Structure formats: structure tokens, C-alpha cells
Amino acid sequence: GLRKEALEELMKLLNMKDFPYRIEGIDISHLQGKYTVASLVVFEDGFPKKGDYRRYKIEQDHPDDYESIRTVVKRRYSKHPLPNLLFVDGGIGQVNAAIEALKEIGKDCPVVGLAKKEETVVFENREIHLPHDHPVLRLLVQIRDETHRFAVSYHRKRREKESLRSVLDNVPGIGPIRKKKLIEHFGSLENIRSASLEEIARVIGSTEIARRVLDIL
Ligand SMILES: [Cl-]
Ligand SMILES: [Cl-]
Ligand SMILES: [Cl-]
Ligand SMILES: [Cl-]
Ligand SMILES: [Cl-]
């Protein structure tokens, strides 16, 4: 989680009057020819609150990350209250997009970013360049890492079937129909690795073949 200690230090650095009890963070990721997916995470008292995570889809073939951030802010905060602090995955451009959107809808909350390449902190139209091991820098990196983790999970079910298939393709002498029965039943490698020999065997009608699946898993 985010250290209460470090949350306190963050409040000082950003000159916040209020403790950052609720922090929301945004990742912007684009799927070419389809849409931008904005993934929103929530920390409450420094802990992830996974039930409150949300995504926003902005339909467009080509990325426009600043307009995407603007759209997210207007969509979300027309419905939800503002957090104590909003984190954006990026620097001056991203931070300013969020601030200007907030101004548009008559709302006000602190917005902080982390430059993508330099790990510079962006706040109130300034860069703050901290030493690498500064606790506030580490805290913001933790937020960024959770926004990324949630973002990457948009692809999960697809990625998982594909990785399951790849591992099964090294099982000698199992045909495509049985491999597909396994993929449809288990969905992923983690899932089929929690399964008994008997369970695997029942799905494909063969203990001989299920033993070999277990060998190669
Ligand atoms: Cl929410
Ligand atoms: Cl909602
Ligand atoms: Cl960290
Ligand atoms: Cl998808
Ligand atoms: Cl096939």
C-alpha cells in the first residue's frame, strides 16, 4: 500500500490542506483503429479499492491523449465526487489537460503527474525534480504501477487463452479439438495448473493425454 508516512510527506510537497484519503489515478492506453481505454484506479487511505476501479472508452482510430484525459474528467466527475488528489500518468501536458477540464465543469481538486521518462513530479505548472530515492517519488511510482497493472488487465482474458494455447502446443499427441476443450474449460494457465489429473482427464476423455498435459505444465 501507500505508506501513511509517505502520504503525509506528499501532502506537504503539494501543499495540500487535506490528507489525501482518496486518490484516483488514470492510465491512457490506445488501441489503434478502435479506441482509447482510460483506466482509473482508486486508493482509499493508501490501499487499493478494487471495487471502485473503472474504465472509460473514447472512440477514435488515432490517439489524442490530452483530449482523452479531458473527456475522462468530464465524464467521471459529472457523476462521481472528486477525490482528494488526482494522479495522471504523464507530465505537464497531461496534468494541464485534467486541470482545464476540471475548470470547465466548475470543479477543483489537486492534480499531480509523473513524467513518463524522467520520473519528474508535475504539479501547479512546475516540474519538481526529486532525488531518486525520495519517498514521495516512490509513492507516486507505486500509484503509476497500479494504474499500469489495471490498464494491462484490459487484455487479460485474451492474453490468457493465447498463453494457455502456446503451452498446450508443446504437449505431444494432443489434437486441436482436445486442446480447445481445455482452453474453453480452464481459460488460463493458472487455472489449469490448479486442476487435478482427474479433472483434466474428464474434460478431454483421456487420462493418458491428461498426464502429459501435467508433465509439460
Ligand atoms: Cl469509481
Ligand atoms: Cl460508475
Ligand atoms: Cl515505488
Ligand atoms: Cl479487449
Ligand atoms: Cl486449432
Swiss-Prot record:
Q: Where in the cell is it found?
A: Cytoplasm
Q: How does it assemble?
A: Interacts with UvrB in an incision complex.
Per the entry, what this protein does is:
The UvrABC repair system catalyzes the recognition and processing of DNA lesions. UvrC both incises the 5' and 3' sides of the lesion. The N-terminal half is responsible for the 3' incision and the C-terminal half is responsible for the 5' incision.
Family (UniProt): Belongs to the UvrC family.
Protein name, please? UvrABC system protein C
Protein's organism? Thermotoga maritima (strain ATCC 43589 / DSM 3109 / JCM 10099 / NBRC 100826 / MSB8)
Top-level taxonomy: Bacteria, Thermotogati, Thermotogota, Thermotogae, Thermotogales
The UniProt gene name for this protein comes to: uvrC
Q: Which part of the full protein is shown?
A: 341 to 557 of 557
